[PDB]
Symmetry: D3
Subunit: 236 residues, 6 copies
Amino acid sequence: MTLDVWQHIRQEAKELAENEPMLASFFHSTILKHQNLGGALSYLLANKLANPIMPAISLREIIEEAYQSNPSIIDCAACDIQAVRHRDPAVELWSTPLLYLKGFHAIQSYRITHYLWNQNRKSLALYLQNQISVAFDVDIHPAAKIGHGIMFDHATGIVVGETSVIENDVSILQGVTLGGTGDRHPKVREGVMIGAGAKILGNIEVGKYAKIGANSVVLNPVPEYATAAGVPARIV
Amino acid sequence: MTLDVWQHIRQEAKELAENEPMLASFFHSTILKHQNLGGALSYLLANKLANPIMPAISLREIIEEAYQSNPSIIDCAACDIQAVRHRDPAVELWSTPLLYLKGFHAIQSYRITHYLWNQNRKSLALYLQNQISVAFDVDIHPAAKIGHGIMFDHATGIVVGETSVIENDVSILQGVTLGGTDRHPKVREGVMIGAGAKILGNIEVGKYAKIGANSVVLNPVPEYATAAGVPARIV
Amino acid sequence: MTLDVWQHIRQEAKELAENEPMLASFFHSTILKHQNLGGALSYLLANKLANPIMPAISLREIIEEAYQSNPSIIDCAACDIQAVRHRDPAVELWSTPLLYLKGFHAIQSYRITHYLWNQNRKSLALYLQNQISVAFDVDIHPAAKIGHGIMFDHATGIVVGETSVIENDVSILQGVTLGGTHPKVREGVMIGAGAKILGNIEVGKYAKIGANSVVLNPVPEYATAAGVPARIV
Amino acid sequence: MTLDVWQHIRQEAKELAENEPMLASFFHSTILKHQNLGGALSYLLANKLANPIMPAISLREIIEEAYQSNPSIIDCAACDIQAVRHRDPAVELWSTPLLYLKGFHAIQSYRITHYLWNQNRKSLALYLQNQISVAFDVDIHPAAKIGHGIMFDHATGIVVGETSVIENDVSILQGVTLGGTDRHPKVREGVMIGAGAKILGNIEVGKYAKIGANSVVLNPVPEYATAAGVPARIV
Amino acid sequence: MTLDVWQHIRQEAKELAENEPMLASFFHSTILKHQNLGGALSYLLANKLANPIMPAISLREIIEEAYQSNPSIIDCAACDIQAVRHRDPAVELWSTPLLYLKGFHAIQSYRITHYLWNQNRKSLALYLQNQISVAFDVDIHPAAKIGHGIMFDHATGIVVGETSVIENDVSILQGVTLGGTGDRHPKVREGVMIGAGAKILGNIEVGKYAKIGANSVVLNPVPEYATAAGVPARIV
Amino acid sequence: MTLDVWQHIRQEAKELAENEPMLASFFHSTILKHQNLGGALSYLLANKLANPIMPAISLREIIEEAYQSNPSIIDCAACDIQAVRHRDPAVELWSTPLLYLKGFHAIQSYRITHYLWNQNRKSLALYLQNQISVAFDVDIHPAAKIGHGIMFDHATGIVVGETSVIENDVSILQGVTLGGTHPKVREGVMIGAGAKILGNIEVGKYAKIGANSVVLNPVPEYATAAGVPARIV
Ligand SMILES: CC(C)(COP(=O)(O)OP(=O)(O)OC[C@H]1O[C@@H](n2cnc3c(N)ncnc32)[C@H](O)[C@@H]1OP(=O)(O)O)[C@@H](O)C(=O)NCCC(=O)NCCS
Ligand SMILES: CC(C)(COP(=O)(O)OP(=O)(O)OC[C@H]1O[C@@H](n2cnc3c(N)ncnc32)[C@H](O)[C@@H]1OP(=O)(O)O)[C@@H](O)C(=O)NCCC(=O)NCCS
Ligand SMILES: CC(C)(COP(=O)(O)OP(=O)(O)OC[C@H]1O[C@@H](n2cnc3c(N)ncnc32)[C@H](O)[C@@H]1OP(=O)(O)O)[C@@H](O)C(=O)NCCC(=O)NCCS
Ligand SMILES: CC(C)(COP(=O)(O)OP(=O)(O)OC[C@H]1O[C@@H](n2cnc3c(N)ncnc32)[C@H](O)[C@@H]1OP(=O)(O)O)[C@@H](O)C(=O)NCCC(=O)NCCS
Ligand SMILES: CC(C)(COP(=O)(O)OP(=O)(O)OC[C@H]1O[C@@H](n2cnc3c(N)ncnc32)[C@H](O)[C@@H]1OP(=O)(O)O)[C@@H](O)C(=O)NCCC(=O)NCCS
Ligand SMILES: CC(C)(COP(=O)(O)OP(=O)(O)OC[C@H]1O[C@@H](n2cnc3c(N)ncnc32)[C@H](O)[C@@H]1OP(=O)(O)O)[C@@H](O)C(=O)NCCC(=O)NCCS
């Protein structure tokens, strides 16, 4: 439930603020003063994507309209907090992905642009896409397709092309590019783990549960449950 | 030509603001309220490079002085919008590169630093270079020589060394380093460099050559050739 | 000495402000108005990590708390300045690393998180760790151990894991990752641009890792590892 | 009625933005991009009351909650634009009071604090009262009762005590104090108070009375009368 | 000359910065890095009138266009710095009125709105008029007529009506209102000194070199060289 | 005691933050995260006097320099808090003056300028004097002498001249001017709203000045002066 992840987050925030006086204001502003995940998420995103030309107050108006028109966007977020939570040894707090992980922020921001790109509000989608790249150093074309339970660990330098597909429970590290030389982008299936720096190019298939070596340059489809590594990548 | 690009850009901004109420203010303050490309660009770049210590208002004075001093800088920008637009079917509006692409922004901010360095105003050149690296995550030394018709698509992690040169119509993708092992690469016109490529040393990359993603280029590459691999060999 | 490096910085800032009118304000605010490196460094760092939710005035309180508690943090900063200075003919001024190099800023910022982490103030360490990623495009777990004379040249995309150890005088370029399949990089080493060093493995003193290498096996002292996967070359 | 005022306001903003390129962004972000009076007002008031500690984004949440909770607040605002517009020939646009008059802003910010005080959220009421005093230089205690059709022309230095009441269609000018020597004034409808006037004590100021500039009112004033002087006598 | 007042100001700034390290940045930003009075004045005004909706960068664009279209506006400023300079015992520095006096800033800002009101750019004039009131607590209707050598000492609460006239070398203190009950506003002649809190109402004449008591309520014309005081004011 | 008033403030802030979710952040930033009144006061003041040219982080350095040099400045602040508290049934919390009353902020800000003025750092005193006018609509020359237990209620439009002297426990309302045709206001006095006291003249202990009065002649102890011009009434 969005309300159960939200419950853990609220309870954690209360504690964390009691233990860290220098951060209490922060916990109250992002979480404790909000009523639900969307309120906290939109407050967080408006502030992070904010700039001199489009202030946090104006960015938030945009994000809230999107959450109001399609509430499931928020649900995708709760599913994303959960995934990083146990697909990451160290992340034990539910509030950690929500508050600090730029890959998480990048994905949730992207979901906003995707909804917008589907409403044919492309100028708005392109504006956000690029502010997402400036703030988080993640560039996902609004038209790309991405499922839930997604993890962009560290995230710096991740580039996802216009025709890319990313299924559920995929994990992507820093420096990964999904791109090409119509469909000229990868179709990364369920559960795939992509190592740091890997460049996946072409309308090729990366089968469910496959693993990609760090720095690979994958050009040929990768079988399900297989490991692809090397430049160019071979099944290993 | 500036006037045509600018006019196309202006006509676009009008229709776009008309169709997207939420961005109307953005279109008006970045483009519509300005009279020429120079004013729109210096407005955007100052705001994107601004920080608490050097606010947009103060950085705009620097940018303006450079534009008033060397007007051809704005030209190179006009040529870059042109390239990006055509050389990337995806981009289908004159105003997109101006408004949204950080690679484009980083190059134009760079042309400003290059001028400052050529005028012996290095502390200013250095400050900007690094603010450019913070904003757009593109680090181009000010003494690097770069032509026009340049495309830094995505751009994250690009690093260009001090003695590098980049001729016209070159396209560079994310994570590309032009650096050392004169100690940096010389990229001739029409070269396409793939994502992640590391090109090391004062070596020649011939015109219209293609560099594969993640390659590590150590020896010269032949014009029209294709280099891929770690080390890069010809394929 | 922190007082030595500081004197050099003040002499330079005074002339730099003299020669560039449009930047004099900047030199006075970061350097000349302060009385020591700690004051300049905390001001610079608070301002760069600042955001709408936690402004510079608030972040500085945190950094100053740390510097007051452990003054040696500032000493490591003075040591890292020389390194980027001597280890790089491309940088000649003492104040250049302090003022403009994001890799340097990311390292000094990390040192603050590392101290907090060790005081068990982990939420503050995590908050900063991630603001460091946003501001400088560098992600170093506060638990990582990093000695001094460190140089993060260009820095973009550098990622260092929770159990990584980086000894003295190491240099690390853009796109470098130290983590798991975390690394132990001995003194004087380095990790060339785009290289990924993965696994509980050791990189010997003065070894060299080649651009875009993928290191999975230990690397010998003074050895040059390169390739995907890395091979002694 | 809100819908007519709002629609008039919107039609005005369109033409104005059309005629003044430099303010087009302002008109779009304050009015044009919003769907109702509530959104435009909460946007303006949050931005005008914002400070480094409580940014516009955070103050807007408070304002929104109050508007969603007690919708009639926005109404009183609509009635105040109406008054000002007509009761001051100088003002000749529905949008001017909304956009430019700080007296109008201070009253609407006040209605928010009054609601918060009535909901026993005093620390919030107190915070705003004082931020209102900083922004607009108008200090209205939150427990003061104020009707609609109110005009605070110029408004600088206005101070309204805790037990004050102000009925409909009252106009108050700069430097006016409604305070003590229940300990504050009761201003009936239609009263016009001149600049600098100090009205002290729980005394009645009858409907449609006129108070001269710089007067000091200590005894009750008769309806339709005119009080002027220090002390004020009837003239 | 605008260039001589500017010369004193520049030289003073250089010294003042050398003597006050904690303010050096300020002296460099407002004065020393600028080439002329207009550059320094517009930088100062854009920053002071700035707000979340219209940032200093955008306000400055407006002010610079005005100075470019009518450079004499700047000259009026130099004449104003001079007047406060010796019509005020304590003010010995030329840079003091320029940098710190809100009445001075208020007047110079007003001159911008007056030029704009004459170009029929009323929405812009009204916007500035009111931001001037918010920042400096001075409200001068753009249509009012005001000469040079003007001093708004302290300035808080000064209100100047739409049809008011203020001639050269007039001095006005805090709390002064020029207003009314067509011409329904005062015509304050050359050299008049108006005490704090005085309310001058009606299309009445205040003769050159007259003096107005603090807190007066002037309703009848005041003779040249005379003193008016009281509520209502009498010639005394 | 500053420690007494501080304890009261912390107890209140803790409950206030408890009862109002939308303001908890504010209470933690101004009060709870700090360890004493000086920390809270400088944070509050730096933030209110901040502007694009001199941000809060920069103004705080100046205030802290002053508080470090003359800790007693903070003691006068604690004393002024009680005054607004006891001298006003409309204010009941110790933290209300510290948090929300601009007259109080203007007074404490002035004290900083007064100290600088006396250290001969007049440009800094003048800069602040005028930022105080912009932020709080109060203009007090740094050279003015003002004792403690001072209450500037509502404050708007208050103007105090260079040679003015205000002793202890005085209360001054909005629109008040102390200057020349500067005043000497003895202990416990006051100056009602809109009153203008002009000339090198004396206002006696516990005297009362009526709203909009124009005082030109000395006023006797316990006397009530009112009128334009003021007359003993
Ligand atoms: C490929 C990977 C996923 C492990 O998968 P695996 O199925 O266990 O593969 P193995 O370890 O069995 O090794 C099989 C072959 O792959 C090679 N190999 C492993 N990783 C490689 C890489 N990144 N590039 C190229 N070759 C690689 C091995 O040397 C081995 O070769 P061999 O058959 O000649 O002996 C892993 O090595 C990797 O690259 N992980 C990236 C994780 C990462 O980026 N972490 C950073 C954390 S911040
Ligand atoms: C090299 C490249 C430019 C295509 O060039 P090309 O002229 O078509 O050369 P080819 O595609 O015919 O490839 C020839 C050989 O190189 C190999 N190769 C291709 N790209 C390679 C790369 N990046 N690294 C290593 N080998 C590569 C192929 O497997 C092929 O092998 P073969 O010997 O069996 O014939 C391209 O594949 C590439 O690397 N593009 C990067 C673009 C990018 O980064 N896009 C991201 C967009 S966000
Ligand atoms: C490791 C390094 C620092 C110096 O290496 P070295 O000890 O001098 O080794 P050499 O230069 O003699 O090269 C030896 C072999 O390595 C190969 N090699 C070198 N760098 C390589 C790389 N990155 N990937 C793959 N092979 C590489 C050479 O082709 C040579 O091949 P050989 O066995 O056929 O003789 C350097 O080669 C390198 O990669 N530097 C990157 C620095 C960088 O990132 N700069 C960016 C500045 S922004
Ligand atoms: C009193 C006032 C409202 C007019 O009311 P009115 O009904 O016309 O009363 P009158 O004008 O006939 O004045 C009658 C007497 O009051 C006196 N008077 C008028 N205004 C006075 C004032 N503010 N204080 C003292 N006496 C005043 C007149 O001199 C006149 O004297 P008389 O006995 O010789 O006949 C008006 O003069 C006034 O004070 N207006 C203030 C408006 C203001 O502040 N405007 C600023 C706009 S920014
Ligand atoms: C009126 C003023 C300008 C002096 O002018 P002046 O021509 O010298 O007038 P005089 O002092 O000779 O006094 C003449 C009469 O005016 C009266 N008077 C003076 N100031 C008065 C005032 N503000 N209100 C009413 N009556 C006043 C005197 O009591 C005297 O009356 P008398 O003939 O019955 O004895 C002066 O008193 C004043 O009000 N100055 C204001 C300056 C100010 O606001 N300073 C604040 C600095 S921040
Ligand atoms: C002075 C003051 C504090 C108390 O005065 P007091 O000692 O009780 O004097 P009194 O109330 O007995 O009044 C005595 C005479 O003064 C007159 N008077 C009082 N205040 C006056 C004023 N401001 N102007 C002119 N005359 C005044 C009375 O009408 C009375 O006249 P009388 O001689 O015919 O008997 C008070 O009258 C006053 O003006 N307070 C203003 C407080 C304020 O500004 N509050 C605003 C809260 S935001």
